[model samples]
Target: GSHMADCGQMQEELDLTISAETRKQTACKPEIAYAYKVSITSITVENVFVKYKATLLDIYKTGEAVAEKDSEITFIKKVTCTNAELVKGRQYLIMGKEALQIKYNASFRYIYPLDSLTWIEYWPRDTTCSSCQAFLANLDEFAEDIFLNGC
Candidate 1:
């Protein structure tokens, strides 16, 4: 889809342009997302559906949240990843610009991680390509290094 492609380009641009010092700001995060949500389950592909059983860990923004649910005590969501490489049950911190989907919809979403809290899964362009898997691993390290170096 065009939207996904645009997001991919945007992500690449962010990866290349963002500095470590600015990375601390939520605006510098992926998608320029201000909210950070940690989920317990890693999103994965299941038949035609992307299934995820996640519990919300933390919300970064303190001001009036974008939605009502953000004002609640806790948060969680069911997430799915089509081509994203994820550990079955690894904990992860996710940053997004929008509110969590309250209901399950037949769609895929991407979440970027921050700091040492690393676990990201996203739809891949080519699932059969084994080399892409290795690439994702390397990309993971690259992101961590960016966070560590703050460059």
Candidate 2:
């Protein structure tokens, strides 16, 4: 079974109180977008950021080899500069991005950490702030549908 409600559920819930005009002000998108997924293995907290060690679970292979998408690679450190609280073992749908960074005083410039990468963690309850309530428990199914179907 699909874990995601037909993308319209978010719209239905939003229409009840989140007016289109107000939506622009206190806006939360009531739709879906493409992204990769990951299961966090470890977490470390700083003042306003959280760093994670993760294993890539699923991704859209735009340019890669067969099974290359399924290669056994691990992410050592990824920073959530957006301050999104994350659990140690939960799965997350990643809508954030990688960025390029350079500092004048930097010795050997490397790329930026996974900072401000927008994400919504999967959850089985409505108590906490979570997206894809339908996918809350059925994220595996949701991922299979989209990861193979088209996106």
CA lDDT of every candidate: 0.36, 0.39
**Model 1 quality (TM-score):** 0.36
Clashes counted in candidate 1 amount to 3
Clashing pairs in 1: 20-150, 20-151, 84-122
Candidate 1, 6-70: lDDT as tens digits: 11111231133434333345434555434333444544454543445455444443212242222
| TM-score, per-candidate, Cα-based | 0.36, 0.43
Query: How many clashes in candidate 2?
Result: 1
> What value does the lDDT take at residue 116 in candidate 2?
34
Segments of candidate 1 deviating more than 4 angstroms? 1-22, 26-33, 42-45, 62-83, 99-151
Error of 1 at 87 (Å): 2.2
Per-residue accuracy of model 2 over 3-115 as CA lDDT, tens digit each: 32221011122112322233122112223222455576776566744445655666642212112343332222323222344567766544433323343585533222443
